Every structure is written in C-alpha cells, then in structure tokens.
PDB file of all heavy atoms in Angstrom:
ATOM      1  N   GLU A 500      15.393  -5.950  -4.684  1.00  0.00           N
ATOM      2  CA  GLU A 500      16.148  -5.774  -5.954  1.00  0.00           C
ATOM      3  C   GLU A 500      16.387  -4.221  -6.234  1.00  0.00           C
ATOM      4  O   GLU A 500      17.223  -3.905  -7.022  1.00  0.00           O
ATOM      5  CB  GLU A 500      15.486  -6.431  -7.054  1.00  0.00           C
ATOM      6  CG  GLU A 500      16.094  -6.472  -8.374  1.00  0.00           C
ATOM      7  CD  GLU A 500      15.337  -7.278  -9.458  1.00  0.00           C
ATOM      8  OE1 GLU A 500      14.212  -7.690  -9.112  1.00  0.00           O
ATOM      9  OE2 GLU A 500      15.791  -7.311 -10.665  1.00  0.00           O
ATOM     10  N   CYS A 501      15.774  -3.378  -5.603  1.00  0.00           N
ATOM     11  CA  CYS A 501      15.631  -1.885  -5.691  1.00  0.00           C
ATOM     12  C   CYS A 501      15.278  -1.570  -7.084  1.00  0.00           C
ATOM     13  O   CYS A 501      15.949  -0.957  -7.905  1.00  0.00           O
ATOM     14  CB  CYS A 501      17.015  -1.234  -5.298  1.00  0.00           C
ATOM     15  SG  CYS A 501      17.518  -1.514  -3.621  1.00  0.00           S
ATOM     16  N   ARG A 502      14.054  -2.078  -7.407  1.00  0.00           N
ATOM     17  CA  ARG A 502      13.462  -1.888  -8.793  1.00  0.00           C
ATOM     18  C   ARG A 502      12.380  -0.795  -8.677  1.00  0.00           C
ATOM     19  O   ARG A 502      11.201  -1.005  -8.594  1.00  0.00           O
ATOM     20  CB  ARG A 502      12.881  -3.259  -9.280  1.00  0.00           C
ATOM     21  CG  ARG A 502      12.364  -3.133 -10.682  1.00  0.00           C
ATOM     22  CD  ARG A 502      13.611  -2.825 -11.618  1.00  0.00           C
ATOM     23  NE  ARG A 502      13.070  -2.647 -12.929  1.00  0.00           N
ATOM     24  CZ  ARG A 502      12.929  -3.628 -13.890  1.00  0.00           C
ATOM     25  NH1 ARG A 502      13.230  -4.815 -13.471  1.00  0.00           N
ATOM     26  NH2 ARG A 502      12.491  -3.432 -15.105  1.00  0.00           N
ATOM     27  N   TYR A 503      12.855   0.402  -8.924  1.00  0.00           N
ATOM     28  CA  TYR A 503      12.158   1.574  -8.302  1.00  0.00           C
ATOM     29  C   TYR A 503      10.835   1.850  -9.185  1.00  0.00           C
ATOM     30  O   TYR A 503       9.806   2.299  -8.598  1.00  0.00           O
ATOM     31  CB  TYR A 503      13.087   2.787  -8.353  1.00  0.00           C
ATOM     32  CG  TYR A 503      14.105   2.618  -7.243  1.00  0.00           C
ATOM     33  CD1 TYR A 503      15.307   2.141  -7.444  1.00  0.00           C
ATOM     34  CD2 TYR A 503      13.741   2.948  -5.894  1.00  0.00           C
ATOM     35  CE1 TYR A 503      16.291   1.999  -6.531  1.00  0.00           C
ATOM     36  CE2 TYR A 503      14.707   2.919  -4.930  1.00  0.00           C
ATOM     37  CZ  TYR A 503      15.961   2.335  -5.183  1.00  0.00           C
ATOM     38  OH  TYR A 503      16.756   2.163  -4.064  1.00  0.00           O
ATOM     39  N   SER A 504      10.849   1.691 -10.441  1.00  0.00           N
ATOM     40  CA  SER A 504       9.723   2.092 -11.279  1.00  0.00           C
ATOM     41  C   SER A 504       8.489   1.181 -11.174  1.00  0.00           C
ATOM     42  O   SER A 504       7.485   1.573 -11.591  1.00  0.00           O
ATOM     43  CB  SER A 504      10.212   2.178 -12.764  1.00  0.00           C
ATOM     44  OG  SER A 504      11.161   3.091 -13.025  1.00  0.00           O
ATOM     45  N   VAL A 505       8.716   0.001 -10.576  1.00  0.00           N
ATOM     46  CA  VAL A 505       7.574  -0.843 -10.289  1.00  0.00           C
ATOM     47  C   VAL A 505       7.068  -0.822  -8.901  1.00  0.00           C
ATOM     48  O   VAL A 505       6.088  -1.388  -8.535  1.00  0.00           O
ATOM     49  CB  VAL A 505       7.929  -2.296 -10.728  1.00  0.00           C
ATOM     50  CG1 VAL A 505       8.728  -3.017  -9.622  1.00  0.00           C
ATOM     51  CG2 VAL A 505       6.652  -3.150 -11.072  1.00  0.00           C
ATOM     52  N   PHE A 506       7.733   0.021  -8.074  1.00  0.00           N
ATOM     53  CA  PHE A 506       7.370   0.187  -6.650  1.00  0.00           C
ATOM     54  C   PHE A 506       6.166   0.858  -6.558  1.00  0.00           C
ATOM     55  O   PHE A 506       5.241   0.475  -5.733  1.00  0.00           O
ATOM     56  CB  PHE A 506       8.480   0.935  -5.856  1.00  0.00           C
ATOM     57  CG  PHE A 506       9.687   0.156  -5.728  1.00  0.00           C
ATOM     58  CD1 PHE A 506      10.833   0.888  -5.233  1.00  0.00           C
ATOM     59  CD2 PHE A 506       9.708  -1.156  -5.723  1.00  0.00           C
ATOM     60  CE1 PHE A 506      11.958   0.153  -4.972  1.00  0.00           C
ATOM     61  CE2 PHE A 506      10.847  -1.847  -5.486  1.00  0.00           C
ATOM     62  CZ  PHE A 506      11.978  -1.204  -5.018  1.00  0.00           C
ATOM     63  N   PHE A 507       5.750   1.908  -7.294  1.00  0.00           N
ATOM     64  CA  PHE A 507       4.562   2.674  -7.218  1.00  0.00           C
ATOM     65  C   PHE A 507       3.432   1.740  -7.817  1.00  0.00           C
ATOM     66  O   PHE A 507       2.272   1.813  -7.242  1.00  0.00           O
ATOM     67  CB  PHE A 507       4.787   3.925  -7.956  1.00  0.00           C
ATOM     68  CG  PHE A 507       5.611   4.821  -7.323  1.00  0.00           C
ATOM     69  CD1 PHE A 507       6.404   5.711  -8.194  1.00  0.00           C
ATOM     70  CD2 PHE A 507       5.866   4.774  -5.989  1.00  0.00           C
ATOM     71  CE1 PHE A 507       7.381   6.583  -7.474  1.00  0.00           C
ATOM     72  CE2 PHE A 507       6.768   5.661  -5.332  1.00  0.00           C
ATOM     73  CZ  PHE A 507       7.494   6.486  -6.128  1.00  0.00           C
ATOM     74  N   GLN A 508       3.712   0.934  -8.873  1.00  0.00           N
ATOM     75  CA  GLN A 508       2.717  -0.019  -9.358  1.00  0.00           C
ATOM     76  C   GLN A 508       2.296  -0.992  -8.319  1.00  0.00           C
ATOM     77  O   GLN A 508       1.178  -1.121  -7.978  1.00  0.00           O
ATOM     78  CB  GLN A 508       3.312  -0.672 -10.590  1.00  0.00           C
ATOM     79  CG  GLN A 508       3.795   0.148 -11.641  1.00  0.00           C
ATOM     80  CD  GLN A 508       2.614   0.887 -12.176  1.00  0.00           C
ATOM     81  OE1 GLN A 508       2.391   2.103 -11.937  1.00  0.00           O
ATOM     82  NE2 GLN A 508       1.655   0.221 -12.912  1.00  0.00           N
ATOM     83  N   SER A 509       3.342  -1.687  -7.686  1.00  0.00           N
ATOM     84  CA  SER A 509       3.038  -2.735  -6.659  1.00  0.00           C
ATOM     85  C   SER A 509       2.594  -2.094  -5.410  1.00  0.00           C
ATOM     86  O   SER A 509       1.605  -2.695  -4.745  1.00  0.00           O
ATOM     87  CB  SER A 509       4.339  -3.440  -6.488  1.00  0.00           C
ATOM     88  OG  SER A 509       5.460  -2.465  -6.237  1.00  0.00           O
ATOM     89  N   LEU A 510       2.958  -0.782  -5.120  1.00  0.00           N
ATOM     90  CA  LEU A 510       2.315  -0.228  -4.018  1.00  0.00           C
ATOM     91  C   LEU A 510       0.885   0.202  -4.237  1.00  0.00           C
ATOM     92  O   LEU A 510       0.071   0.156  -3.274  1.00  0.00           O
ATOM     93  CB  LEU A 510       3.083   1.088  -3.684  1.00  0.00           C
ATOM     94  CG  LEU A 510       2.808   1.962  -2.447  1.00  0.00           C
ATOM     95  CD1 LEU A 510       4.136   2.467  -1.915  1.00  0.00           C
ATOM     96  CD2 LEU A 510       1.903   3.114  -2.721  1.00  0.00           C
ATOM     97  N   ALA A 511       0.571   0.520  -5.461  1.00  0.00           N
ATOM     98  CA  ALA A 511      -0.772   0.711  -5.801  1.00  0.00           C
ATOM     99  C   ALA A 511      -1.639  -0.491  -5.682  1.00  0.00           C
ATOM    100  O   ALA A 511      -2.751  -0.433  -5.220  1.00  0.00           O
ATOM    101  CB  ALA A 511      -0.805   1.295  -7.233  1.00  0.00           C
ATOM    102  N   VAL A 512      -1.074  -1.644  -6.094  1.00  0.00           N
ATOM    103  CA  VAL A 512      -1.637  -2.989  -5.808  1.00  0.00           C
ATOM    104  C   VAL A 512      -1.989  -3.127  -4.414  1.00  0.00           C
ATOM    105  O   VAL A 512      -3.167  -3.444  -3.952  1.00  0.00           O
ATOM    106  CB  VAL A 512      -0.889  -3.989  -6.472  1.00  0.00           C
ATOM    107  CG1 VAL A 512      -1.591  -5.417  -6.170  1.00  0.00           C
ATOM    108  CG2 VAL A 512      -0.704  -3.966  -7.949  1.00  0.00           C
ATOM    109  N   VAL A 513      -0.905  -3.034  -3.511  1.00  0.00           N
ATOM    110  CA  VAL A 513      -1.154  -3.354  -2.170  1.00  0.00           C
ATOM    111  C   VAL A 513      -2.098  -2.295  -1.420  1.00  0.00           C
ATOM    112  O   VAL A 513      -2.728  -2.735  -0.570  1.00  0.00           O
ATOM    113  CB  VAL A 513       0.290  -3.429  -1.472  1.00  0.00           C
ATOM    114  CG1 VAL A 513       0.239  -3.612   0.077  1.00  0.00           C
ATOM    115  CG2 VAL A 513       1.150  -4.555  -2.054  1.00  0.00           C
ATOM    116  N   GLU A 514      -2.072  -1.081  -1.949  1.00  0.00           N
ATOM    117  CA  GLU A 514      -2.874  -0.064  -1.356  1.00  0.00           C
ATOM    118  C   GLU A 514      -4.431  -0.270  -1.775  1.00  0.00           C
ATOM    119  O   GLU A 514      -5.197  -0.085  -0.954  1.00  0.00           O
ATOM    120  CB  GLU A 514      -2.391   1.375  -1.674  1.00  0.00           C
ATOM    121  CG  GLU A 514      -3.308   2.505  -1.265  1.00  0.00           C
ATOM    122  CD  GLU A 514      -3.408   2.500   0.298  1.00  0.00           C
ATOM    123  OE1 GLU A 514      -2.560   2.141   0.979  1.00  0.00           O
ATOM    124  OE2 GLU A 514      -4.510   3.044   0.658  1.00  0.00           O
ATOM    125  N   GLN A 515      -4.559  -0.676  -3.009  1.00  0.00           N
ATOM    126  CA  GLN A 515      -6.010  -1.043  -3.254  1.00  0.00           C
ATOM    127  C   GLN A 515      -6.429  -2.288  -2.609  1.00  0.00           C
ATOM    128  O   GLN A 515      -7.696  -2.522  -2.467  1.00  0.00           O
ATOM    129  CB  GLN A 515      -6.089  -1.119  -4.802  1.00  0.00           C
ATOM    130  CG  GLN A 515      -6.015   0.135  -5.491  1.00  0.00           C
ATOM    131  CD  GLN A 515      -7.004   1.205  -5.117  1.00  0.00           C
ATOM    132  OE1 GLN A 515      -6.721   2.132  -4.361  1.00  0.00           O
ATOM    133  NE2 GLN A 515      -8.238   1.006  -5.394  1.00  0.00           N
ATOM    134  N   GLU A 516      -5.484  -3.198  -2.259  1.00  0.00           N
ATOM    135  CA  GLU A 516      -5.868  -4.288  -1.376  1.00  0.00           C
ATOM    136  C   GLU A 516      -6.138  -3.798  -0.076  1.00  0.00           C
ATOM    137  O   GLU A 516      -7.012  -4.355   0.722  1.00  0.00           O
ATOM    138  CB  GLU A 516      -4.794  -5.320  -1.445  1.00  0.00           C
ATOM    139  CG  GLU A 516      -5.128  -6.528  -0.684  1.00  0.00           C
ATOM    140  CD  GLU A 516      -6.249  -7.343  -1.184  1.00  0.00           C
ATOM    141  OE1 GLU A 516      -6.583  -7.327  -2.490  1.00  0.00           O
ATOM    142  OE2 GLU A 516      -7.162  -7.724  -0.394  1.00  0.00           O
ATOM    143  N   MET A 517      -5.470  -2.765   0.363  1.00  0.00           N
ATOM    144  CA  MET A 517      -5.634  -2.208   1.798  1.00  0.00           C
ATOM    145  C   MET A 517      -7.001  -1.547   1.924  1.00  0.00           C
ATOM    146  O   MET A 517      -7.403  -1.305   3.091  1.00  0.00           O
ATOM    147  CB  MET A 517      -4.480  -1.261   2.062  1.00  0.00           C
ATOM    148  CG  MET A 517      -4.204  -0.764   3.386  1.00  0.00           C
ATOM    149  SD  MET A 517      -3.606  -1.922   4.525  1.00  0.00           S
ATOM    150  CE  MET A 517      -1.916  -2.169   3.875  1.00  0.00           C
ATOM    151  N   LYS A 518      -7.739  -1.191   0.811  1.00  0.00           N
ATOM    152  CA  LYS A 518      -8.855  -0.469   0.979  1.00  0.00           C
ATOM    153  C   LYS A 518     -10.037  -1.246   1.552  1.00  0.00           C
ATOM    154  O   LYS A 518     -10.742  -0.795   2.416  1.00  0.00           O
ATOM    155  CB  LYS A 518      -9.328   0.027  -0.469  1.00  0.00           C
ATOM    156  CG  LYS A 518      -8.347   0.864  -1.004  1.00  0.00           C
ATOM    157  CD  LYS A 518      -8.252   2.273  -0.414  1.00  0.00           C
ATOM    158  CE  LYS A 518      -7.102   3.082  -1.063  1.00  0.00           C
ATOM    159  NZ  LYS A 518      -7.621   3.521  -2.499  1.00  0.00           N
ATOM    160  N   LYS A 519     -10.216  -2.522   1.096  1.00  0.00           N
ATOM    161  CA  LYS A 519     -11.352  -3.350   1.417  1.00  0.00           C
ATOM    162  C   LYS A 519     -11.014  -4.517   2.418  1.00  0.00           C
ATOM    163  O   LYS A 519     -11.834  -5.417   2.572  1.00  0.00           O
ATOM    164  CB  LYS A 519     -11.893  -3.975   0.152  1.00  0.00           C
ATOM    165  CG  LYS A 519     -12.451  -2.873  -0.864  1.00  0.00           C
ATOM    166  CD  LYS A 519     -12.871  -3.460  -2.147  1.00  0.00           C
ATOM    167  CE  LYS A 519     -14.139  -4.322  -1.999  1.00  0.00           C
ATOM    168  NZ  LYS A 519     -15.254  -3.419  -1.587  1.00  0.00           N
ATOM    169  N   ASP A 520      -9.832  -4.378   3.015  1.00  0.00           N
ATOM    170  CA  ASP A 520      -9.445  -5.382   4.017  1.00  0.00           C
ATOM    171  C   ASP A 520      -9.630  -4.712   5.324  1.00  0.00           C
ATOM    172  O   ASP A 520      -9.142  -3.582   5.555  1.00  0.00           O
ATOM    173  CB  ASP A 520      -7.996  -5.905   3.808  1.00  0.00           C
ATOM    174  CG  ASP A 520      -7.602  -7.081   4.646  1.00  0.00           C
ATOM    175  OD1 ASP A 520      -8.531  -7.589   5.408  1.00  0.00           O
ATOM    176  OD2 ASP A 520      -6.555  -7.659   4.381  1.00  0.00           O
ATOM    177  N   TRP A 521     -10.199  -5.443   6.345  1.00  0.00           N
ATOM    178  CA  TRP A 521     -10.584  -4.925   7.666  1.00  0.00           C
ATOM    179  C   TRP A 521      -9.379  -4.739   8.466  1.00  0.00           C
ATOM    180  O   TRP A 521      -8.257  -5.055   8.016  1.00  0.00           O
ATOM    181  CB  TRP A 521     -11.597  -5.814   8.325  1.00  0.00           C
ATOM    182  CG  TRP A 521     -11.024  -7.180   8.637  1.00  0.00           C
ATOM    183  CD1 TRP A 521     -10.377  -7.521   9.722  1.00  0.00           C
ATOM    184  CD2 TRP A 521     -11.015  -8.263   7.802  1.00  0.00           C
ATOM    185  NE1 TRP A 521     -10.049  -8.852   9.654  1.00  0.00           N
ATOM    186  CE2 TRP A 521     -10.418  -9.320   8.352  1.00  0.00           C
ATOM    187  CE3 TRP A 521     -11.582  -8.351   6.490  1.00  0.00           C
ATOM    188  CZ2 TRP A 521     -10.197 -10.489   7.726  1.00  0.00           C
ATOM    189  CZ3 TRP A 521     -11.325  -9.657   5.910  1.00  0.00           C
ATOM    190  CH2 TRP A 521     -10.770 -10.684   6.483  1.00  0.00           C
ATOM    191  N   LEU A 522      -9.481  -4.112   9.760  1.00  0.00           N
ATOM    192  CA  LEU A 522      -8.521  -3.698  10.657  1.00  0.00           C
ATOM    193  C   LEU A 522      -7.294  -2.964   9.991  1.00  0.00           C
ATOM    194  O   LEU A 522      -6.265  -2.997  10.543  1.00  0.00           O
ATOM    195  CB  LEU A 522      -7.916  -4.912  11.438  1.00  0.00           C
ATOM    196  CG  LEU A 522      -7.360  -6.217  10.852  1.00  0.00           C
ATOM    197  CD1 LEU A 522      -5.779  -6.119  10.553  1.00  0.00           C
ATOM    198  CD2 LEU A 522      -7.605  -7.420  11.806  1.00  0.00           C
ATOM    199  N   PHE A 523      -7.646  -2.257   8.933  1.00  0.00           N
ATOM    200  CA  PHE A 523      -6.713  -1.496   8.150  1.00  0.00           C
ATOM    201  C   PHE A 523      -7.127  -0.054   7.886  1.00  0.00           C
ATOM    202  O   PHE A 523      -6.409   0.697   7.299  1.00  0.00           O
ATOM    203  CB  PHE A 523      -6.455  -2.262   6.837  1.00  0.00           C
ATOM    204  CG  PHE A 523      -5.604  -3.335   6.929  1.00  0.00           C
ATOM    205  CD1 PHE A 523      -5.649  -4.375   5.967  1.00  0.00           C
ATOM    206  CD2 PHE A 523      -4.620  -3.558   7.939  1.00  0.00           C
ATOM    207  CE1 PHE A 523      -4.868  -5.547   6.140  1.00  0.00           C
ATOM    208  CE2 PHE A 523      -3.826  -4.726   8.126  1.00  0.00           C
ATOM    209  CZ  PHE A 523      -4.006  -5.657   7.241  1.00  0.00           C
ATOM    210  N   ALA A 524      -8.359   0.331   8.377  1.00  0.00           N
ATOM    211  CA  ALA A 524      -8.772   1.754   8.414  1.00  0.00           C
ATOM    212  C   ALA A 524      -7.766   2.615   9.291  1.00  0.00           C
ATOM    213  O   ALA A 524      -7.732   3.718   8.810  1.00  0.00           O
ATOM    214  CB  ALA A 524     -10.148   1.755   8.971  1.00  0.00           C
ATOM    215  N   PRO A 525      -7.244   2.235  10.329  1.00  0.00           N
ATOM    216  CA  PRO A 525      -6.138   3.066  11.008  1.00  0.00           C
ATOM    217  C   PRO A 525      -4.765   3.055  10.296  1.00  0.00           C
ATOM    218  O   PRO A 525      -3.791   3.479  10.817  1.00  0.00           O
ATOM    219  CB  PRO A 525      -6.020   2.659  12.454  1.00  0.00           C
ATOM    220  CG  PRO A 525      -7.182   1.832  12.690  1.00  0.00           C
ATOM    221  CD  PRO A 525      -7.565   1.219  11.280  1.00  0.00           C
ATOM    222  N   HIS A 526      -4.735   2.439   9.118  1.00  0.00           N
ATOM    223  CA  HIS A 526      -3.494   2.094   8.483  1.00  0.00           C
ATOM    224  C   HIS A 526      -3.350   2.540   6.982  1.00  0.00           C
ATOM    225  O   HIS A 526      -2.143   2.686   6.595  1.00  0.00           O
ATOM    226  CB  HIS A 526      -3.366   0.609   8.572  1.00  0.00           C
ATOM    227  CG  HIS A 526      -3.468   0.082  10.019  1.00  0.00           C
ATOM    228  ND1 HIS A 526      -4.728  -0.186  10.488  1.00  0.00           N
ATOM    229  CD2 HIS A 526      -2.661  -0.176  11.032  1.00  0.00           C
ATOM    230  CE1 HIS A 526      -4.589  -0.649  11.837  1.00  0.00           C
ATOM    231  NE2 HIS A 526      -3.228  -0.755  12.065  1.00  0.00           N
ATOM    232  N   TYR A 527      -4.367   2.599   6.254  1.00  0.00           N
ATOM    233  CA  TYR A 527      -4.327   2.731   4.762  1.00  0.00           C
ATOM    234  C   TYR A 527      -3.686   3.997   4.382  1.00  0.00           C
ATOM    235  O   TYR A 527      -3.231   3.962   3.269  1.00  0.00           O
ATOM    236  CB  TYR A 527      -5.789   2.538   4.276  1.00  0.00           C
ATOM    237  CG  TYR A 527      -6.660   3.860   4.447  1.00  0.00           C
ATOM    238  CD1 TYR A 527      -6.830   4.571   3.332  1.00  0.00           C
ATOM    239  CD2 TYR A 527      -7.275   3.973   5.702  1.00  0.00           C
ATOM    240  CE1 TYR A 527      -7.747   5.700   3.559  1.00  0.00           C
ATOM    241  CE2 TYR A 527      -7.992   5.199   5.919  1.00  0.00           C
ATOM    242  CZ  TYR A 527      -8.270   5.962   4.713  1.00  0.00           C
ATOM    243  OH  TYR A 527      -9.076   7.008   4.913  1.00  0.00           O
ATOM    244  N   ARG A 528      -3.602   5.010   5.058  1.00  0.00           N
ATOM    245  CA  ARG A 528      -2.908   6.251   4.806  1.00  0.00           C
ATOM    246  C   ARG A 528      -1.558   6.320   5.451  1.00  0.00           C
ATOM    247  O   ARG A 528      -0.588   6.826   4.778  1.00  0.00           O
ATOM    248  CB  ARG A 528      -3.716   7.484   5.110  1.00  0.00           C
ATOM    249  CG  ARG A 528      -4.947   7.683   4.416  1.00  0.00           C
ATOM    250  CD  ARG A 528      -5.817   8.890   4.860  1.00  0.00           C
ATOM    251  NE  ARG A 528      -5.298  10.102   4.451  1.00  0.00           N
ATOM    252  CZ  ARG A 528      -5.715  11.324   4.797  1.00  0.00           C
ATOM    253  NH1 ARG A 528      -6.761  11.338   5.704  1.00  0.00           N
ATOM    254  NH2 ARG A 528      -5.215  12.417   4.394  1.00  0.00           N
ATOM    255  N   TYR A 529      -1.403   5.636   6.497  1.00  0.00           N
ATOM    256  CA  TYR A 529      -0.082   5.595   7.160  1.00  0.00           C
ATOM    257  C   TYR A 529       0.850   4.630   6.433  1.00  0.00           C
ATOM    258  O   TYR A 529       1.998   4.887   6.337  1.00  0.00           O
ATOM    259  CB  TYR A 529      -0.302   5.118   8.708  1.00  0.00           C
ATOM    260  CG  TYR A 529       0.941   5.025   9.407  1.00  0.00           C
ATOM    261  CD1 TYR A 529       1.686   6.251   9.728  1.00  0.00           C
ATOM    262  CD2 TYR A 529       1.590   3.844   9.654  1.00  0.00           C
ATOM    263  CE1 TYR A 529       2.804   6.235  10.370  1.00  0.00           C
ATOM    264  CE2 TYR A 529       2.847   3.883  10.345  1.00  0.00           C
ATOM    265  CZ  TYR A 529       3.512   4.975  10.602  1.00  0.00           C
ATOM    266  OH  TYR A 529       4.613   4.840  11.241  1.00  0.00           O
ATOM    267  N   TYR A 530       0.323   3.572   5.962  1.00  0.00           N
ATOM    268  CA  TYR A 530       1.193   2.528   5.325  1.00  0.00           C
ATOM    269  C   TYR A 530       1.786   3.030   3.997  1.00  0.00           C
ATOM    270  O   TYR A 530       2.954   2.663   3.682  1.00  0.00           O
ATOM    271  CB  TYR A 530       0.238   1.416   4.981  1.00  0.00           C
ATOM    272  CG  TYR A 530       0.829   0.242   4.294  1.00  0.00           C
ATOM    273  CD1 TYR A 530       1.527  -0.625   4.996  1.00  0.00           C
ATOM    274  CD2 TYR A 530       0.845   0.100   2.903  1.00  0.00           C
ATOM    275  CE1 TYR A 530       2.034  -1.850   4.467  1.00  0.00           C
ATOM    276  CE2 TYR A 530       1.368  -1.126   2.292  1.00  0.00           C
ATOM    277  CZ  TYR A 530       2.089  -1.903   3.106  1.00  0.00           C
ATOM    278  OH  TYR A 530       2.591  -3.034   2.574  1.00  0.00           O
ATOM    279  N   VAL A 531       1.140   3.922   3.266  1.00  0.00           N
ATOM    280  CA  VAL A 531       1.512   4.661   1.975  1.00  0.00           C
ATOM    281  C   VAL A 531       2.868   5.256   2.276  1.00  0.00           C
ATOM    282  O   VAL A 531       3.968   4.908   1.663  1.00  0.00           O
ATOM    283  CB  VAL A 531       0.523   5.633   1.555  1.00  0.00           C
ATOM    284  CG1 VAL A 531       0.970   6.264   0.185  1.00  0.00           C
ATOM    285  CG2 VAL A 531      -0.730   4.905   1.170  1.00  0.00           C
ATOM    286  N   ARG A 532       2.842   6.376   2.981  1.00  0.00           N
ATOM    287  CA  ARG A 532       4.080   7.106   3.386  1.00  0.00           C
ATOM    288  C   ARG A 532       5.106   6.357   4.099  1.00  0.00           C
ATOM    289  O   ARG A 532       6.353   6.500   3.981  1.00  0.00           O
ATOM    290  CB  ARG A 532       3.733   8.483   4.059  1.00  0.00           C
ATOM    291  CG  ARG A 532       3.565   8.222   5.507  1.00  0.00           C
ATOM    292  CD  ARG A 532       3.465   9.688   6.238  1.00  0.00           C
ATOM    293  NE  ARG A 532       4.717  10.315   6.124  1.00  0.00           N
ATOM    294  CZ  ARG A 532       4.814  11.662   6.299  1.00  0.00           C
ATOM    295  NH1 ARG A 532       3.839  12.454   6.448  1.00  0.00           N
ATOM    296  NH2 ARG A 532       6.057  12.136   6.016  1.00  0.00           N
TER     297      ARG A 532
END
C-alpha cells in the first residue's frame, strides 16, 4: 500500500522479533537496511 509512516513501526516489530529468533544473528543488522 506504500503506507510509509507505519513502516518503521512494523519494521521495529519485525526487528525485535529478529532479536530472539535463531539463525538470524548473521541477519539482524543486514535485514534492517
């Protein structure tokens, strides 16, 4: 939908999910950018 102001919210959700999920340590900073 290109709903830009909720992208950082939802990205924060997915990134905090990325913290405690395994096989994602080579990924959690790469996935952001």
Side-chain angles (χ1 to χ4, degrees):
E500 190 179 357
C501 301
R502 186 63 185 271
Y503 288 97
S504 295
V505 79
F506 286 166
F507 294 145
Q508 301 300 108
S509 49
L510 185 144
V512 175
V513 177
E514 175 61 27
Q515 290 303 111
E516 184 62 36
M517 192 70 72
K518 301 291 179 66
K519 298 175 70 66
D520 194 357
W521 63 93
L522 56 83
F523 283 152
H526 306 83
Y527 73 105
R528 294 176 75 186
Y529 180 73
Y530 183 82
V531 177
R532 75 171 299 160

